[PDB]
Symmetry: C3
Subunit: 423 residues, 3 copies
């Protein structure tokens, strides 16, 4: 008797009601009950999404790479990579701007020196690039490594397309049967995503309630100033960067938002970019009208290697730590911050738990060495106090940038269905 | 070579009885090492051949069955089979307590204990176990052999395929039908391989029962022998009283059910593995009981996972044994708490690895028998574990039998039972 | 632009140029640079090959077992097993012969007694044989265990063949759909192998360059005698054993060599038999002309349990250590060496980390006990100093013996396409 409501209003009601409920319940100390009784529902939602993340990626990408030309796929890849890099750089730049504007960490008033530390910690870039190529596709599937799955699925789709054009008949029949199996699997995955979207309001409610109950009291003082700065920066990235990029390519951005809102809310409430990937892919297919050969490749790669929100988060937090210990970053230092942030988003591709690694590398690039007990470690733990509050918004902005790049590359290659954008 | 020329049913029965007598004779004379070195490998090969098929057959059969059935009908089937499982488990602990008090298990152990109720062993939170039913990676759940997430994913996939095959578009319907045909072929090949392995099954049953009797045959004396007798009488009671009455009230002739299930029964008994017998149990369900895939392809793996009436009866006997051993006999209310906590542990230990010791520890803790090292209750528990395999054979047999009985009952209720298989002449 | 050249001439140029380049660069001490800048390309090539091993083996073997009779498959298995054992015995024989000819270890002049014994237990044959039978096919696929995959694929193919001959019609359609899926997967895998063969020159160059740069300086004194002995023994095994076996069965050996050249070079540069397995399978089908039901089963089993090169290597190294410590092996001890070497190649079938277990087993079989600090341990580390130079040839000869056995069994079963052998 609950499914009778519109799903969009249901997800919005879930979000707002969970926010207010978690805030009031954490302000009254019953947050444990929220962790005991309310959070399991959001946990169930996130588990249902993670269940679908891998098969949908495999099947959708093999089908899309099959139903497209290799030169087209390479052109799409170069376009989407240039887009991702430009958006990440603009995100770090906006983050530094809003950090210097809010003067984040100015009132922390901590004392620190130049006590250095050596680190050979950055993961080898060559080894990660090699690790893009799996040594066992079944293992990469079981271990949930998305980039090896992308590589294997693209190669398999290209092979299937080359196989269906043979003078022999057995070869064409077998290749077409395989492609039909993969297509049925992908369609079933999208249907199951649509089905799970009915439980999404309860999951959003529970997740936002737990997050607000736990870390709602901690957003005071300089941490509150940082929260305001990061949210202003994310809003700035969205509006300025994404809307300008969309209108330049002649697409209505407000409709883009009305379509992406589902993936936006899901990414925001789950704080997992790759975990929302099924919802983002469904939004690409059955609302925006993007061709499979575009998004089935750009969206997983975007969720993996394109994080504008985290880029802006690092850009603001480095200035916060700098002003906290009393060593504000110079202009050249901020330029180095932007450069090392993009280089860390690229060099930590698929490396597990890279957010702390990326932030440590960004701090190292300017000299802020994360030695235990040091004041910089104190400021970093201060930030990790509100890390989840920031993670919601940064994940939302990451998935939004991914979707914007996908639709832009589709509009360029004329693979975008305009019927869904004219009402 | 010319060994398949005999009926495979008589062959597995002969294997069982000859291996039982052979293991008893070889273990009573101390030659158990030779049996462990030369004879057991064949039973190991049999159990490995059976384990090989468990995952693909379950996945494919359940995807096909959930596809070829209605979602509301499947949910009704789930509710029916779950209430059946719980009622049978409760009756099983009740029978176990009855036969334990009748045999007076543990009376002559004569151990000393006080009221020193020490607390240990934080139980894993139930909510996380319930959530773990939903997989986070189907490929990973397949590789790890986790049965319940595979069940969930397969049900969802079958429902999706059925709803996909009824679309106004035509290409999508063809693709969905191709996928369903792939799963159907995989399942049929798996059942054919189960039938093939059933020809080697006599050697496996012989070797397994021989090894078990050789190892733990000398240890079934005194109070441990009384426990063996009590638990086997209780398992026989559960079979006869509970299962036959449940079948006859629902209008099924129980002797036919037993004569058909005997293959899976013998396999479960000799292998002591429920999920390892699951392929044989499903083939018996299809080609003997006449159950539709949409019923058993869902109820039989879930039953092998979360329905163990034999283990409930085993706990009902062993808790009374330990209580009488340490000299603190269980009251009637304590025995009711035993039954309730045993059913609740069969529910709360769904798919958690190594959950049998967890369940027994929980039932012992629920009455105060706390397993502190060196304590008398731990001593009595190790005394029981001395004959663990001897008891495991029968309890596994009864688990698989209860699973099959529930599946057949729920199938007959949903009209998915083929009555042609039940008419003589 | 660069693919416009014949790929065979390209891989040969890569091999020889990389050999000379690594030799020149290691004689000047800059070999570290080769490990930093050159080796990643060979690593990429080897990972691209590792990616394909599981899908190609699974699909090819299920298809071949389907498209063949079970009795024929068993006869082929018996033939190929007898071939493998005979070739391994001949390999240890040639190793002992060339070792006695080169007098390996004579000038080491080490001192040893009859002291303390070590016992690397041989894996019990029963447990390994049982582990051939998987308990979970998905797990064996993810873990890359080849023999359980072989067993499961053979059983599945036989089941599909028995299913296609049933009175029911839906069952035949489903079985044919499944077999078509597997066939398409196998054909796509072979197409991808052909594609990777275009990058193969760079990988071959990089691998041989790294191996020569690292272990090029190490070929001095008795180690040079060991290198010469093992290479002469492998050359003899090829010419004497394999050519005679091929000509006896009415096959032209020079044609076999000219066809196997691709898998030979790949195995040589990658030193991995199972990693070269896709190239060997493609060469077997589309050059040698063997039916799927033959090679799709014999070639993986050969890569797993047939290693003539390693057998000859052990035959040489045992004599080397014996002459090093000053206790030359008697004739009966050398016979025990060959017997235990064949029995260890059989008893370490699919057991992880073999060859070290096998060599320890042979040394225990003659009494040379590998206790740490002992002179035998010193000589063994002396040998392991140049392990890769020998490993190249050992892997090449292993895959060559596998291919020769496959072609011989095909000629016997008349499953060999003679058109591919007509000039
Ligand atoms: N989890 C957030 C997100 O949804 O992007 C965000 O990125 C984490 C991150 C970074 C690099 C590679 C992969 C991931 N990852 O997906 O955990 C963060 O924690 O700040
Ligand atoms: N071993 C018997 C069987 O399952 O066949 C039976 O159950 C043990 C049990 C319990 C829970 C999860 C898994 C298992 N398991 O498979 O060992 C028993 O010993 O009473
Ligand atoms: N690597 C060589 C080869 O390609 O055969 C050769 O065998 C190693 C070996 C042995 C047993 C199982 C697997 C492997 N393996 O593939 O590393 C060697 O190192 O001497």
């Amino acid at each position: 008797r609950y499914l009778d409501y519109p799903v969009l209003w249901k997800i919005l009601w879930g979000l707002v009601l969970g926010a207010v409920f978690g805030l009031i319940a954490g302000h009254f100390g019953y947050a444990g009950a929220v962790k005991t009784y309310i959070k399991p529902f959001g946990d169930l939602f996130v588990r249902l999404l993670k269940m679908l993340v891998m098969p949908i990626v495999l099947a959708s990408l093999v089908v899309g790479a099959a139903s497209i030309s290799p030169a087209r796929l390479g052109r799409v890849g170069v376009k989407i990579v240039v887009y991702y890099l430009a958006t990440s750089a603009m995100a770090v730049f906006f983050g530094l701007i809003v950090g210097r504007l809010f003067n984040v960490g100015a009132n922390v008033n901590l004392g620190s020196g130049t006590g250095k530390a050596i680190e050979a910690q950055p993961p080898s870039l060559v080894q990660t690039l090699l690790n893009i190529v799996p040594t066992n596709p079944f293992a990469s599937l079981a271990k949930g490594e998305v980039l090896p799955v992308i590589f294997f699925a693209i190669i398999l789709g290209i092979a299937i397309t080359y196989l269906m054009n043979r003078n022999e008949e057995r070869v064409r029949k077998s290749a077409e049967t395989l492609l039909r199996v993969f297509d049925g699997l992908a369609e079933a995955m999208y249907l199951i995503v649509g089905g799970v979207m009915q439980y999404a309001p309860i999951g959003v409610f529970a997740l936002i309630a737990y997050v607000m109950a736990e870390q709602g009291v901690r957003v005071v003082g300089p941490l509150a100033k940082v929260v305001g700065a990061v949210y202003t920066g994310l809003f700035l990235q969205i509006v300025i960067t994404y809307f300008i990029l969309l209108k330049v390519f002649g697409i209505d951005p407000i409709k883009f938002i009305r379509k992406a809102k589902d993936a936006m809310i899901t990414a925001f409430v789950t704080r997992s970019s790759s975990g929302t990937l099924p919802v983002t892919m469904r939004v690409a297919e059955e609302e925006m009208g993007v061709d499979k050969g575009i998004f089935s490749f750009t969206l997983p790669l975007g969720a993996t290697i394109n994080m504008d929100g985290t880029a802006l988060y690092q850009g603001v937090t480095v200035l916060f730590v700098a002003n906290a210990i009393g060593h504000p970053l110079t202009l050249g230092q901020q330029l180095v911050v932007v450069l090392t942030a993009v280089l860390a988003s690229i060099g930590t591709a698929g490396v597990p738990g890279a957010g702390a690694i990326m932030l440590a590398m960004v701090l190292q690039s300017v000299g802020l060495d994360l030695t235990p007990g040091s004041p910089v470690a104190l400021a970093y733990a201060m930030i990790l106090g509100i890390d989840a509050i920031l993670d919601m918004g940064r994940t939302m902005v990451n998935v939004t940038g991914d979707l914007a790049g996908t639709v832009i590359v589709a509009k360029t290659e004329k693979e975008l269905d305009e019927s869904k954008w004219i009402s």
